[PDB]
Amino acid sequence: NQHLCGSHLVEALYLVCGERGFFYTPKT
Amino acid sequence: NQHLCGSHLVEALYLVCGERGFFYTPK
Amino acid sequence: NQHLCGSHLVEALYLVCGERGFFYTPK
Amino acid sequence: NQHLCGSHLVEALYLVCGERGFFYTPKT
Amino acid sequence: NQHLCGSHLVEALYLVCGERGFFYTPK
Amino acid sequence: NQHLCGSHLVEALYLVCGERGFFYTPKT
Amino acid sequence: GIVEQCCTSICSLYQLENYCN
Amino acid sequence: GIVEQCCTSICSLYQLENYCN
Amino acid sequence: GIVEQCCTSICSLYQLENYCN
Amino acid sequence: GIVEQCCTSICSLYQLENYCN
Amino acid sequence: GIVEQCCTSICSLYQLENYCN
Amino acid sequence: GIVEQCCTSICSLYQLENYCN
Numbered sequence: 001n002q003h004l005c006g007s008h009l010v011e012a013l014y015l016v017c018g019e020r021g022f023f024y025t026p027k028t
Numbered sequence: 029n030q031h032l033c034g035s036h037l038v039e040a041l042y043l044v045c046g047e048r049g050f051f052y053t054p055k
Numbered sequence: 056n057q058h059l060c061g062s063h064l065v066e067a068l069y070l071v072c073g074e075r076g077f078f079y080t081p082k
Numbered sequence: 083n084q085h086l087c088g089s090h091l092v093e094a095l096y097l098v099c100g101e102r103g104f105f106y107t108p109k110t
Numbered sequence: 111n112q113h114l115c116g117s118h119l120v121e122a123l124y125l126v127c128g129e130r131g132f133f134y135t136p137k
Numbered sequence: 138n139q140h141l142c143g144s145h146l147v148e149a150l151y152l153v154c155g156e157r158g159f160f161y162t163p164k165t
Numbered sequence: 166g167i168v169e170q171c172c173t174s175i176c177s178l179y180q181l182e183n184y185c186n
Numbered sequence: 187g188i189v190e191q192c193c194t195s196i197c198s199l200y201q202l203e204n205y206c207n
Numbered sequence: 208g209i210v211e212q213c214c215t216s217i218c219s220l221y222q223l224e225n226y227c228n
Numbered sequence: 229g230i231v232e233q234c235c236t237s238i239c240s241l242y243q244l245e246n247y248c249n
Numbered sequence: 250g251i252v253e254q255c256c257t258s259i260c261s262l263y264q265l266e267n268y269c270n
Numbered sequence: 271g272i273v274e275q276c277c278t279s280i281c282s283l284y285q286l287e288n289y290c291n
């Protein structure tokens with residue numbers, strides 16, 4: 001559905017999760 | 029009018045943290 | 056303080072729609 | 083004047099069109 | 111609710127100016 | 138610490154400088 | 166309208182999916 | 187196509203106006 | 208890894224939900 | 229000032245062009 | 250909380266560094 | 271040049287401070 005890296009990926013996570021919050025762990 | 033709200037907060041976190049990664053959880 | 060206003064709305068539309076594309080027209 | 087793709091292109095369209103609104107149709 | 115504030119201002123400057131570059135200084 | 142180009146670089150400068158303001162001069 | 170709705174009150178990404186082509 | 191004008195190629199702000207409603 | 212799912216590969220909005228708390 | 233003007237009231241991209249180098 | 254603090258009042262990037270992994 | 275420091279190469283937040291007024 002979408003190619004997302006860096007700050008765009010994080011903004012996408014914010015939109016989808018919202019109040020739930022999220023974790024961005026790019027290394028593992 | 030203010031500063032790091034919503035979308036801008038998580039962008040600032042990515043800048044500050046980067047490859048380290050970060051957790052985002054409001055109250 | 057709120058949520059998807061102006062620039063952030065069209066960014067959310069791109070995410071949701073993507074290659075499909077989208078129309079943006081305020082009232 | 084500028085190389086613009088994806089979400090950046092869309093934000094650019096929002097800025098230039100504004101109240102007029104716009105259509106993003108990448109496929110055609 | 112309004113328009114080009116903070117982060118959005120410098121993004122609009124980059125669009126308008128680009129390779130020319132620009133200066134940003136609030137009062 | 139970070140690879141930053143175009144509008145992302147500028148947003149980064151805004152965050153770090155803030156009230157101090159900044160100059161974006163990509164050509165020199 | 167959706168643009169006003171998203172800014173004035175709550176908006177879901179599901180509601181925004183109506184405006185895709 | 188806006189993509190071929192402004193993503194795949196380089197385009198101006200007046201070229202972006204073509205896609206306003 | 209979210210990067211290999213959605214940056215290095217292509218992923219969906221339900222795949223992005225996996226990384227919500 | 230432009231930064232305050234754009235945030236407090238209306239701003240055109242034409243007015244912002246004054247701040248390019 | 251930091252998310253509320255950054256939006257309600259002042260936040261430094263130094264304070265935001267606490268939330269890196 | 272900020273571009274060669276931070277776009278073409280990798281740079282730190284203190285390196286970005288060099289370009290504040």
Ligand SMILES: COC(=O)c1ccc(O)cc1
Nearest residue numbers: 016071178179182220221
């Ligand atoms: C485009 O709408 C969705 O499919 C969707 C998926 C996950 C969400 O969290 C929200 C919307």
Ligand SMILES: COC(=O)c1ccc(O)cc1
Nearest residue numbers: 098126199200241242245
């Ligand atoms: C940089 O200023 C312009 O040339 C411009 C072009 C189209 C617009 O809609 C606005 C400004």
Ligand SMILES: COC(=O)c1ccc(O)cc1
Nearest residue numbers: 044153262263266283284
């Ligand atoms: C992550 O925190 C910093 O190291 C930092 C560096 C420069 C600043 O201006 C602010 C914070």
Ligand SMILES: [Zn+2]
Nearest residue numbers: 035036039117
């Ligand atoms: Zn931002």
Ligand SMILES: [Zn+2]
Nearest residue numbers: 036062063118
């Ligand atoms: Zn914003």
Ligand SMILES: [Zn+2]
Nearest residue numbers: 007039117148
């Ligand atoms: Zn941004």
Ligand SMILES: [Zn+2]
Nearest residue numbers: 035062063066
């Ligand atoms: Zn945004």
Ligand SMILES: [Zn+2]
Nearest residue numbers: 011035066089
């Ligand atoms: Zn953004």
Ligand SMILES: [Zn+2]
Nearest residue numbers: 007008090145
């Ligand atoms: Zn980007």
Ligand SMILES: [Zn+2]
Nearest residue numbers: 062117118121
């Ligand atoms: Zn913006």
Ligand SMILES: [Zn+2]
Nearest residue numbers: 062093121144
């Ligand atoms: Zn943006």
